[PDB]
Amino acid sequence: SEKKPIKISADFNAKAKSLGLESKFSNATKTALGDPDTEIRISARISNRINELERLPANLGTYSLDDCLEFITKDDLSSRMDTFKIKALVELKSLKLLTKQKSIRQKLINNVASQAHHNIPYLRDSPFTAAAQRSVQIR
Amino acid sequence: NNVTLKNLTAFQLLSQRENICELLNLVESTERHNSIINPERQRMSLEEMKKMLDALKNER
């Protein structure tokens, strides 16, 4: 507190940490979704939800409490009978198309990362990226 | 042992920050500065120089 708050030593991992740059020497960070245990758990939860959704009845109308103003005469069709059925179908199908969304997302991410050094200014303009792109084109 | 853009930028920024923090006297680097100087190693090297000089002096 009173004295120098840094106290650099000859470790370079405490020295780098004390000045802010700690994770900046590792390739990729540490995350939670990278373990098979959490993956199995998430898959279990998703399968349970899909099971519950599929065990619903097909005839799943909804009484909307605003049908009062629509003077239904036992022959007309209520304009809101399919509102919980539509939501159930939407959730079920969205849960069944998860891998497709994952694939499209990873395609987008890869095709936007591969062009980082060409589309992002502060990466394209550093002397090191420019030097590397020049070094590749040496005839 | 590998050098990527991230490593290079981190190294350069670390050097710059260390230098500036030293300008403001916000860092105490006695351990590094006395492991590089190593006054024990200084005395050892000085005595070795003296012995070698005496050896060269007495061979004549």
């Binding site: 708050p5 | 403001l24 006297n25």
Partner: peptide, 16 residues
């Protein structure tokens, strides 16, 4: 907090 205190003390010692 105390970081600003230390930084400003260092700058004042540097400028004086």
């Amino acid at each position: 907090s105390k970081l600003m205190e230390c930084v400003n003390d260092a700058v004042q010692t540097l400028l004086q």
